[PDB]
Amino acid sequence: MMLYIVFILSVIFVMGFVGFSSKPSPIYGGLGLIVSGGVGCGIVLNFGGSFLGLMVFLIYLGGMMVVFGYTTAMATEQYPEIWLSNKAVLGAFVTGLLMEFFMVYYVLKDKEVEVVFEFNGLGDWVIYDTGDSGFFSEEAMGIAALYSYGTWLVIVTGWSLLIGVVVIMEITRG
Amino acid sequence: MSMVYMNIMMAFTVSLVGLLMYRSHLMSSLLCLEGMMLSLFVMAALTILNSHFTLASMMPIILLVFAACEAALGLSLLVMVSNTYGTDYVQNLNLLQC
Amino acid sequence: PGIVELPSLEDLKVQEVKVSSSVLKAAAHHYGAQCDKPNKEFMLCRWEEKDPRRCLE
Amino acid sequence: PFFDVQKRLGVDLDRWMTIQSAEQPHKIPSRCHAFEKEWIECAHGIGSIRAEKECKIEFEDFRECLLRQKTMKRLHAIRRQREKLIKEGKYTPPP
Amino acid sequence: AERVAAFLKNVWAKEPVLVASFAIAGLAVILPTLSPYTKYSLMINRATPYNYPVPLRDDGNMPDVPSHPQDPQGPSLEWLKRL
Amino acid sequence: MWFEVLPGIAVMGVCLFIPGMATARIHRFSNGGKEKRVAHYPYQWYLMERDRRVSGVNRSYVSKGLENI
Amino acid sequence: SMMKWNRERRRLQIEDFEARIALMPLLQAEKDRRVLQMLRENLEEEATVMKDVPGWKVGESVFHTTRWVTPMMGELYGLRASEEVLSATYGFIWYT
Amino acid sequence: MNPIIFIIILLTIMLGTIIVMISSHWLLVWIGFEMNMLAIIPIMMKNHNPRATEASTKYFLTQSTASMLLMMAVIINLMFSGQWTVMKLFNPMASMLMTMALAMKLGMAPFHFWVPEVTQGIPLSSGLILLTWQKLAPMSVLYQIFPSINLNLILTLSVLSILIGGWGGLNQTQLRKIMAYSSIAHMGWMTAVLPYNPTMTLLNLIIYIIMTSTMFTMFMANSTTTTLSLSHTWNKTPIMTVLILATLLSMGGLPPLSGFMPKWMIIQEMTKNNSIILPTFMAITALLNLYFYMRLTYSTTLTMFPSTNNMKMKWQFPLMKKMTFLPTMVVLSTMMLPLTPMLSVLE
Amino acid sequence: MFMINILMLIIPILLAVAFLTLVERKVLGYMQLRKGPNVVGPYGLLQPIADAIKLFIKEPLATSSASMFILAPIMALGLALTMWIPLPMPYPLINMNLGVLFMLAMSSLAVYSILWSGWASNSKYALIGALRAVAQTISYEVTLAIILLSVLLMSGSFTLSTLITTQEQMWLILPAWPLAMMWFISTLAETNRAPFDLTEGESELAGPFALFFMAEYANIIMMNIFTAILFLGTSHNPHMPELYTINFTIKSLLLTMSFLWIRASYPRFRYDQLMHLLWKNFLPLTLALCMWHVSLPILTSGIPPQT
Amino acid sequence: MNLMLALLTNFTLATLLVIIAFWLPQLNVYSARLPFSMKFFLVAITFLLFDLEIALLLPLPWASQTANLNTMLTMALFLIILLAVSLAYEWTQKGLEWTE
Numbered sequence A: 001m002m003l004y005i006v007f008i009l010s011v012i013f014v015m016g017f018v019g020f021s022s023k024p025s026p027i028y029g030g031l032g033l034i035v036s037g038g039v040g041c042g043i044v045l046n047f048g049g050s051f052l053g054l055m056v057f058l059i060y061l062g063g064m065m066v067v068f069g070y071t072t073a074m075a076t077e078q079y080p081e082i083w084l085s086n087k088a089v090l091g092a093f094v095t096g097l098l099m100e101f102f103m104v105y106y107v108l109k110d111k112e113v114e115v116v117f118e119f120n121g122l123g124d125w126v127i128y129d130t131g132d133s134g135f136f137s138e139e140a141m142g143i144a145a146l147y148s149y150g151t152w153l154v155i156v157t158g159w160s161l162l163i164g165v166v167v168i169m170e171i172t173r174g
Numbered sequence B: 001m002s003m004v005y006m007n008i009m010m011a012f013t014v015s016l017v018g019l020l021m022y023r024s025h026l027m028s029s030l031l032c033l034e035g036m037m038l039s040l041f042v043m044a045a046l047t048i049l050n051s052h053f054t055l056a057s058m059m060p061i062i063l064l065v066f067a068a069c070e071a072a073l074g075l076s077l078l079v080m081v082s083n084t085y086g087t088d089y090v091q092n093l094n095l096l097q098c
Numbered sequence C: 001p002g003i004v005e006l007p008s009l010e011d012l013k014v015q016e017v018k019v020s021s022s023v024l025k026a027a028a029h030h031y032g033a034q035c036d037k038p039n040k041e042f043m044l045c046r047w048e049e050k051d052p053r054r055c056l057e
Numbered sequence D: 001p002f003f004d005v006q007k008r009l010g011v012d013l014d015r016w017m018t019i020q021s022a023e024q025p026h027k028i029p030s031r032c033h034a035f036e037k038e039w040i041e042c043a044h045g046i047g048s049i050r051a052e053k054e055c056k057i058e059f060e061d062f063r064e065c066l067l068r069q070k071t072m073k074r075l076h077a078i079r080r081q082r083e084k085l086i087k088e089g090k091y092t093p094p095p
Numbered sequence E: 001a002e003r004v005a006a007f008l009k010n011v012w013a014k015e016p017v018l019v020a021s022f023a024i025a026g027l028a029v030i031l032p033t034l035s036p037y038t039k040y041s042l043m044i045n046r047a048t049p050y051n052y053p054v055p056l057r058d059d060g061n062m063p064d065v066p067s068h069p070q071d072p073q074g075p076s077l078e079w080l081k082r083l
Numbered sequence F: 001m002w003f004e005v006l007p008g009i010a011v012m013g014v015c016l017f018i019p020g021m022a023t024a025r026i027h028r029f030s031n032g033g034k035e036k037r038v039a040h041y042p043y044q045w046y047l048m049e050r051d052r053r054v055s056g057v058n059r060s061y062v063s064k065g066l067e068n069i
Numbered sequence G: 001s002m003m004k005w006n007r008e009r010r011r012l013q014i015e016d017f018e019a020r021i022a023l024m025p026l027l028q029a030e031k032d033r034r035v036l037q038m039l040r041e042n043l044e045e046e047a048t049v050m051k052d053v054p055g056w057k058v059g060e061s062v063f064h065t066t067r068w069v070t071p072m073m074g075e076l077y078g079l080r081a082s083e084e085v086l087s088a089t090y091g092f093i094w095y096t
Numbered sequence H: 001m002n003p004i005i006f007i008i009i010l011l012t013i014m015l016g017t018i019i020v021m022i023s024s025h026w027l028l029v030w031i032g033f034e035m036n037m038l039a040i041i042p043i044m045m046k047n048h049n050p051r052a053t054e055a056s057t058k059y060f061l062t063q064s065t066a067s068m069l070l071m072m073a074v075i076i077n078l079m080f081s082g083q084w085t086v087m088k089l090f091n092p093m094a095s096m097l098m099t100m101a102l103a104m105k106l107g108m109a110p111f112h113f114w115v116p117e118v119t120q121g122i123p124l125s126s127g128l129i130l131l132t133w134q135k136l137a138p139m140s141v142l143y144q145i146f147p148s149i150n151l152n153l154i155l156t157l158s159v160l161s162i163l164i165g166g167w168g169g170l171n172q173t174q175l176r177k178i179m180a181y182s183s184i185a186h187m188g189w190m191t192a193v194l195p196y197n198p199t200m201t202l203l204n205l206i207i208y209i210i211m212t213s214t215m216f217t218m219f220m221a222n223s224t225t226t227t228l229s230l231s232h233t234w235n236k237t238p239i240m241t242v243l244i245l246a247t248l249l250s251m252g253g254l255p256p257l258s259g260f261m262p263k264w265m266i267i268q269e270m271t272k273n274n275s276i277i278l279p280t281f282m283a284i285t286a287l288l289n290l291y292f293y294m295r296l297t298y299s300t301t302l303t304m305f306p307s308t309n310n311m312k313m314k315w316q317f318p319l320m321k322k323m324t325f326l327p328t329m330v331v332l333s334t335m336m337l338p339l340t341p342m343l344s345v346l347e
Numbered sequence I: 001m002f003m004i005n006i007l008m009l010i011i012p013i014l015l016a017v018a019f020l021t022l023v024e025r026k027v028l029g030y031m032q033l034r035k036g037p038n039v040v041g042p043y044g045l046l047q048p049i050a051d052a053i054k055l056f057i058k059e060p061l062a063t064s065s066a067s068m069f070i071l072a073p074i075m076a077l078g079l080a081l082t083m084w085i086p087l088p089m090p091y092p093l094i095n096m097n098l099g100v101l102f103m104l105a106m107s108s109l110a111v112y113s114i115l116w117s118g119w120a121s122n123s124k125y126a127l128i129g130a131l132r133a134v135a136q137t138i139s140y141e142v143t144l145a146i147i148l149l150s151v152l153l154m155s156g157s158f159t160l161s162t163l164i165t166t167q168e169q170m171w172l173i174l175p176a177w178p179l180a181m182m183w184f185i186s187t188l189a190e191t192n193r194a195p196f197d198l199t200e201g202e203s204e205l206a207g208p209f210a211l212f213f214m215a216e217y218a219n220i221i222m223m224n225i226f227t228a229i230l231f232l233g234t235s236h237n238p239h240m241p242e243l244y245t246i247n248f249t250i251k252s253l254l255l256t257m258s259f260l261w262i263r264a265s266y267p268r269f270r271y272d273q274l275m276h277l278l279w280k281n282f283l284p285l286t287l288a289l290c291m292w293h294v295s296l297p298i299l300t301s302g303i304p305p306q307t
Numbered sequence J: 001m002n003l004m005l006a007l008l009t010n011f012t013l014a015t016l017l018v019i020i021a022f023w024l025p026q027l028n029v030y031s032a033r034l035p036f037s038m039k040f041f042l043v044a045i046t047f048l049l050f051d052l053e054i055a056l057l058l059p060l061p062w063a064s065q066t067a068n069l070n071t072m073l074t075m076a077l078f079l080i081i082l083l084a085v086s087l088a089y090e091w092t093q094k095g096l097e098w099t100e
């Protein structure tokens, strides 16, 4: 049911993580992280994080992960090894995949589960806020406040990005 | 806790185990490091959004910006390693054994 | 911990304003001028009591 | 802070974002604003050693608002019992 | 000064794109402090009512607080209408 | 002559006219002949959901006026 | 030209926002009764369903304080049909 | 490196640390570590060689992993308390994750493996920053979260570091590795007393920094990175050998020298808390460090090792290295015991 | 009802792309003192159909990774169609509160099809050509995003239909023609169009081919539709929405035709020269104009409404 | 639901077009480092760092609605200037050159 959409996305989130965490060829590992990034945006979108969700797409996927794939094609792998052809990768992938399914089966059967810690299984919708009738996006108001309240955050963040340029030029000059 | 936190916490653990159990490519371990950031971004965003902590809405963006800058530094080190040995294999980074 | 006291279904009953939002929007400016006093008395109650059960009247 | 430069200079570098009951854009309140306020006011100035014991009621209420574990557990109980009775045909739900 | 004008002519001949960039960037930094209209930006933003204006409990000692929206006391937006 | 370029431009222009014209007429058909309601903020969604309850048929675009007073 | 039009757009926004402010007391009055009616309705069904559960007290608060606490989504729509719950939870996020 | 860039990068290393020390918000603490780590990598890489690239990469992976774990602890703390204030954490799992993250950053055993390798692979000046200034930011966080730290975890980390640091240094002939293992052992003393009296943690940290800076400066003055190279000092700068001897005996904790003071006060604070077995075990285990400090004194000052003919060419030129603050640092490293009560300024 | 609406967008987009190939050939031809297609159907009107059938029954002529060889064209075509769903013409298919950000986010993903097809080429030299194309594309993404932000400081929001309101009285090209100029050139470089068509240039110094071609030509139309909305806003009459659609289509056609006009008029940039055009010319001006457009509404008291 | 339907339609159609494009009747019976160039790597990294600054500027249209315009304008310009300084540094350190 669509009432479990956030949970279903979170399940797909984990499988994508088991994908690249078992570490196939970095070409495929990069693909697994991209799928998890998109699914991670969807989870954030369903909690009212419209701007935050789109930043994952714009910055994490369209920026960072593009640079990761660019670097992989240039300095790591040019031709991917067949996926899961390695034994450890296949074993690690299968091991993680089975753990996720056993988690998902029990939480859905009992509507709760104790995997080390206690988790409710009624659906994430139950904790949502019941009153909202403002004429603005609260997420947008909070993010916009970076320029009024977060003067100090802007200074240190902007400085660190400038030092990022300086440092990387030093590192690579060799 | 709510049901979503189970899988988001699991995703971080999966990527942490991935990071701590190296294979050969240094790039593969960098991807696990960025996977850890992704799960942190999602968990922080969910907590902040659900609680309606308005001013904290900027925090996931700051986390994303700084972590991307850290990843850029890591990628630069990877290419310098690759220039030295022709691969990003971590077994080559064993000179300081002695 | 105790029991959340709730008003009975009968204490909540009232005659509704069953007109659409374009009707309300159209009349909003005269409505604010005409019905200001009971409206502001209600909103004062809500922000002072911080409890919907205390401002039903 | 290790060095409390902010208080010494009176400058607010990062206190504005430390708690959810602080001032927010357009007075948008957090969901647990009233619980955070009560706990903070109970614990103010007495030190964490004392507050851990003397403000336990406010903190337990605040943690309930934050994660809603008891509320979800209670709902789980009522739903689980309702499914039992309906499975036994002893209960018909109203519209 | 003459050395300043000779420098400006040189860059204008060789790097007009950079000269334009710096001139535009300089105007952006300076003009807000010289503009008589910058003060209205503060006032207009403050005059936009995003949340509900919660009324005050009347204690009998608030002659400056209107009792009705159409009473004369309180902020006026007549300056904004004429803007 | 150059005006023999027009027939291909006309076909292209008709192909690009269809999406906008179709969306507008589908919106009117699905919303009682009016523009589709825009709800970008919680306040507008709240009014639309109140309209759905007030409509009596579960359609936010069915409006009740003073006849319901 | 942009300055003039944007100034007029700011005046048009203020007028729109003031229409909302005029209606807010009425909408707030309705929202209070709707929430309390739903909570009261959920309370009738709990009394029936949890009648023979040992120790259960019906409508017992989980909070120590007696202060009114805004119910979360599962408290109001806990026992209602899935279509209504879906609209109340994801309708706005999913709208076009 | 351009001299102006080197200054700006050094100031950024300091600024990142300062942000950690003045912040009340956990995000700013995390930012301080991120900024600090970004700026330190270029000074590890500055000599451009495979060893410096391996050290910078090993350092980056360790610190990045530790910062991810720190951000986890922060987010878990937010979930269970709804606030970001830098103080005690409000969840035991968060406390373990932050403690482990900070132990990794400090290079405490069993997260110590990177310290000897990274220090060996970078220049002496960079190792000086790594083993002194970089301890400030993590220790200042531990100073503020210690009420919520698991006592068994922190004392286990301390005991392991004192053992690993002591044993690891016995097998070393490289001076940078000797300093690395010496650093690991000294971190253990600092964290062992933290649950009882953080002031004594600060005292140990300050004195350790002073003696560590002295030794690195004296190694830099002569460009010595190995024991055998250091053994040529007597035939060039005899004064330097005496200063090295005095400083090493101080780092060994021998009275009447300054390095006795932190061990002396830590033992006092632990005994006031009826901790007797642990301080005694620590003091006896620190004899391992004294052994390989004494070994260096034998080959540097108390015996004259064989020389080389080309050394005579060195007799004709003076020391031109800055040796900044060395005369002050060496006197503080050795002659401060009579002023021990001055530790109250750190209260 | 909604699925009909989706198809009344998808199908016309593909048909418009098909006949843009004819219009391009005929417009280029007449600028070259010739005719272009005029035999295959009257005035060449069946030429796109013959080309389409021909390409799809051609032999589909080893990939270094089958999954990525197939992913790249699906990504290209799927993303290209997705960029159309928030466009207000005048009503969008999906009305997004952050439609401008959505288009920026989706367009940033399009570079993966270049990267993946370079990986799947199984050739060292094709991978290098793909990486050069990617570097060009991301370089011009920088100015496009900053130019867009500058314009939105006059509009007030990320909603695409608000650009219509912002230009009720006047086109945004008048207050922002310096940005319009760099925006227009940036779109050419972003779509690898002449004089920025270095992939086809540097390279020469069936169905799968057709699919990539459709994706690129759909992007070309879409970018010029975006340009029309961004800088040449059409007035919307709610009782006669077709009036908006006619005027806005004409502007988009003319902007698209000017892409062909430019291809016919100039030689090609060198790779290093088009990099300098961005990093040393456009980006400095874009940064200065971004500061200027942050200050201007404040200093004129012309800040737009949030909503 | 509508956006999910649209996305599923777009990519589902793209999959189908690729399918028939690869399978029609034919009628016949019979990981090193890629010649690594450092300059292209620095373009990608420079794009990344500038992209993160753009992420910080995107809120600006909303930030202009604040009453704290004095602070907001100063920080907006400060961020853009620091972006310009980054470009100026790369420019003067030969980071935008394609020779050698």
Ligand SMILES: CCCCCCCCCCCCO[C@@H]1O[C@H](CO)[C@@H](O[C@H]2O[C@H](CO)[C@@H](O)[C@H](O)[C@H]2O)[C@H](O)[C@H]1O
Pocket (backbone or CB within 6 Å): A117, A118, B009, B012, B013, B016, H076, H091, H092, H093
């Ligand atoms: C090194 C592993 C790295 C991956 C980390 C993975 C994420 C870890 C998530 C930790 C979040 C759960 O944290 C845990 O939640 C439960 C839920 O009440 C808390 O509560 C639990 O212990 C306390 C004990 O007084 C009580 O509340 C109760 O007995 C029990 O429910 C725990 O005190 C807390 O430690």
Ligand SMILES: CCCCCCCCCCCCO[C@@H]1O[C@H](CO)[C@@H](O[C@H]2O[C@H](CO)[C@@H](O)[C@H](O)[C@H]2O)[C@H](O)[C@H]1O
Pocket (backbone or CB within 6 Å): A148, A149, A151, A152, A155, D010, D011, D012, D013, D016, D023, H015, J068, J071
């Ligand atoms: C290493 C870098 C060295 C450079 C150091 C520069 C430090 C700059 C510190 C900036 C913060 C100064 O101090 C802080 O400023 C802002 C306004 O500017 C004020 O903030 C003001 O606007 C916002 C909006 O409400 C809120 O924070 C608060 O309501 C108000 O006080 C703070 O009340 C003041 O404490």
Ligand SMILES: CCCCCCCCCCCCO[C@@H]1O[C@H](CO)[C@@H](O[C@H]2O[C@H](CO)[C@@H](O)[C@H](O)[C@H]2O)[C@H](O)[C@H]1O
Pocket (backbone or CB within 6 Å): I052, I053, I056, I057, I058, I059, I060, J025, J026, J027, J028
């Ligand atoms: C857009 C919808 C279009 C609908 C059109 C439907 C028409 C279906 C009938 C298609 C007939 C194609 O005809 C056939 O195509 C294939 C394309 O590789 C050609 O090629 C094929 O045959 C040759 C030998 O003859 C083989 O070596 C080759 O490997 C094989 O591909 C044939 O030479 C041609 O005879």
Ligand SMILES: CCCCCCCCCCCCO[C@@H]1O[C@H](CO)[C@@H](O[C@H]2O[C@H](CO)[C@@H](O)[C@H](O)[C@H]2O)[C@H](O)[C@H]1O
Pocket (backbone or CB within 6 Å): E029, E030, E032, E033, E034, E038, E039, E042, I298, J068, J069, J070, J073, J074, J077, J078, J081, J082
């Ligand atoms: C490398 C670091 C670069 C940092 C660059 C920072 C540049 C900042 C330049 C402009 C900063 C101030 O810019 C502008 O100045 C005028 C001064 O009258 C202020 O004042 C103006 O607006 C305020 C509203 O707040 C009114 O009360 C006032 O009457 C009006 O004159 C503006 O509020 C401010 O927006």
Ligand SMILES: N=C(N)NC(=N)NCCc1ccc(I)c(Cl)c1
Pocket (backbone or CB within 6 Å): I018, I019, I020, I021, I022, I024, I025, I047, I048, I049, I051, I052, I055, I210, I213, I214
């Ligand atoms: N570049 C041009 N304008 N001419 C040209 N030969 N284009 C390519 C031809 C083509 C490709 C795909 C399809 I579908 C169609 Cl219908 C036509």
